[PDB]
């Protein structure tokens, strides 16, 4: 009853992506606008994780680790909710002054990713998600990515994990009755969870490429942006940073 | 600088 009241508190308010909205649709002008806002969003989910019940008693290390491997799925994540309850999963609501139509799926040069971040909108949906489900599950995605090896202290972080997993099976439980709804609803949304996964993976990829050879396609990319990118990133695209999933 | 923002003040 409490937790539930806590994610509802912590959670980000609206963040503005500063695009030119009066400048014609181009690769340039709508990557650079993206990192941009990834910069700004990267600030929040920082507060937003710090206010997190039991982020403060982990690791300093962990803590901004695995918040470097995560930003990711939470960003997409949280903008497939955004583009459901403002465009209707019609469009991608990326910011209030970056909605992305058809046309600029293409000029980003990654229509196809584009389209499976729809679909994750259109999950929640589908699934009839509730602000309450949803909530926890993006708290879920923040330590839902570590290393190999494992964390500084993957002690702390196991048990963590352990009890969002917890919290998330509350919210559900504490609305149904029958024992056969319960299990089926937690298997839909710890598949949508997972589901987050590959999406994250290929804009990895993407944002990966985009930044080696950004000073020939004239892309700007903020200083945070580029250190996570540069550093944190390749260990995802190489194997070092392997995510979590509940299924196999 | 995102120790920075880690570890800010207020
Ligand atoms: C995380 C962001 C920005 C925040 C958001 O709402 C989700 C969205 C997903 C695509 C990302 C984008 C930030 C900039 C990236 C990383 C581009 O370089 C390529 C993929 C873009
Ligand atoms: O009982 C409930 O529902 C509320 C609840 C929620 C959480 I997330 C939780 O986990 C930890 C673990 C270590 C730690 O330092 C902290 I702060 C919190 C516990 I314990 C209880």
Known sequence: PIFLNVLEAIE?????????????????????????????????????????????????????????????????????????????????????????????????????????????????GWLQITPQEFLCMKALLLFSIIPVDGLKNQKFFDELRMNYIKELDRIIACKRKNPTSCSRRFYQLTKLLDSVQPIARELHQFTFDLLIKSHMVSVDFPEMMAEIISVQVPKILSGKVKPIYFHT | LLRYLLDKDD
């Open chain 1, 12 to 124: 980000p308010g609206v963040v503005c992506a500063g695009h030119d909205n009066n400048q014609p649709d181009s690769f340039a002008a709508l990557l650079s606008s993206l990192n941009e806002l990834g910069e700004r969003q990267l600030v929040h989910v920082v507060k937003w994780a710090k206010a997190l019940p039991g982020f403060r008693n982990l690791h300093v290390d962990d803590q901004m680790a695995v918040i470097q491997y995560s930003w990711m799925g939470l960003m997409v994540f949280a903008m497939g909710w955004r583009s459901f309850t403002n465009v209707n999963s019609r469009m991608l609501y990326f910011a209030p002054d970056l909605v992305f139509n058809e046309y600029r799926m293409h000029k980003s040069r990654m229509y196809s990713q584009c389209v499976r971040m729809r679909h994750l909108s259109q999950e929640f």
